[PDB]
């Protein structure tokens, strides 16, 4: 069966200081041996996260670019996420594509080289309030996930993130059953246009708001196989998480 | 007070542990001039790594950073993070920011100021397409630039100004000395009449694209070309004959 996948996304936030006393916590944590735990720092603590973290944690990168060496003043490739001794990515976070503008082509292409340079890559999809309010759930996020798709040719290095756009900031809240619904929709799209097997063992978590006392429910739903979470991940909070199906 | 000669080495998007390592023993190698202020800007990966490896004498810089301390900006990272890493400056409106990345001019004052209020250094790069050369506002478009950059700084003795035309970035097309000259004056003079006559005498205006060990001593000789922002040739052994244009 899917292992249950927790990523802690902790966004522009934290210094040495505070990251170190964070991860002095995950490090006494005792994790789950049915749980995946992937912790993923600014750009400047990658290196510095891997050194202090305990090898049962994975680190990512939380964005990178398109190719392995080049002129991209601000810019760090896969080679260099490696090199650092991170194993994963986060690719088309919602405050890459509606804050920088990222495309999808881009998006896609950076899924391509990533997965290609040997890394894992965390995909993340989801609908903005007006669309979801036009009816168009559906189609906004399968388009995403179809050039996703078309650039991933080994899916078990590959989770697929579901992130209520619509959700963050702005009057509404999504539901277990609402997050339920969108996850079950998506497996069944990678059971029709991949295969039964991918369908069966993609890890596809939920990328809107978790925290200790949501975490159980949200988990219990049976096309939900983990977490990308925001706030609560630079917090002891995010252990509760991490323990979501225990 | 003359103003300090400064070259800053910009990495862009290259090296790794191993292959930075051997560059930054050859720089810690290198004599470097007194009066020749040396800035290296490595990768946001290995700012921490570059920092702990290169001689004190050498500074290192941020490549970019945002406009706010702490945020919900998955991908970025801020000043404060900069500084904590133990480098004292941060590149901001670089040609690939604004022209690969799309960066707007009103981001880029936001992200000095920003800087600037968190005790960083900030090199603010500036220039012109091709085609705005090739239409003639060349003047027009650096002075628009610098202005939005100026309306964003209270403390010059931080900044430097880097004046780096697009169609001479990585093409090999280097400006000539005149070309170089001629563009500095007029930022100079537009310093003077729009900030003050101690800020255009003060501070440093350094000219970047296709820099090159052949190139720099004629640049540098120039009365308002004070020094270079060099990326390809930062990562090669003329870099030292850059440091050394003006002995």
Do not use: T
């Given at each position: 069966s899917r292992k249950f996948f927790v990523g802690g996304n902790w966004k522009m936030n934290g210094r040495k200081q505070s990251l170190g006393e964070l991860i002095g916590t995950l490090n006494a944590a005792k994790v789950p041996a049915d749980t995946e735990v992937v912790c993923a720092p600014p750009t400047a603590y990658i290196d510095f996260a891997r050194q202090k973290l305990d090898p049962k944690i994975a680190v990512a990168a939380q964005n990178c670019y398109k190719v392995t060496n080049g002129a991209f003043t601000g810019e760090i490739s896969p080679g260099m996420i490696k090199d650092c001794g991170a194993t994963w990515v986060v690719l088309g976070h919602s405050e890459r594509r509606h804050?920088?503008?990222?495309?999808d082509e881009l998006i896609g292409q950076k899924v391509a080289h990533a997965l290609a340079e040997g890394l894992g890559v965390i995909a993340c999809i989801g609908e903005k309030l007006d669309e979801r309010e036009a009816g168009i759930t559906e189609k906004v996020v399968f388009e995403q996930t179809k050039v996703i798709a078309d650039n991933v040719?080994?899916?078990?290095?590959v989770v697929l993130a579901y992130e209520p756009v619509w959700a963050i900031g702005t009057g509404k809240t999504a539901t277990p059953q609402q997050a339920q619904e969108v996850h079950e929709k998506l497996r069944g799209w990678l059971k029709s246009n991949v295969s039964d097997a991918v369908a069966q063992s993609t890890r596809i978590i939920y990328g809107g708001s978790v925290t200790g006392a949501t975490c159980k429910e949200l988990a219990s739903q049976p096309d939900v196989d983990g977490f990308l979470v925001?706030?609560?991940?630079?917090?002891?909070e995010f252990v509760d998480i991490i323990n979501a199906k225990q």
């Open positions: 804050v920088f503008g990222e495309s040719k080994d899916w078990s290095k925001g706030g609560a991940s630079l917090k002891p």
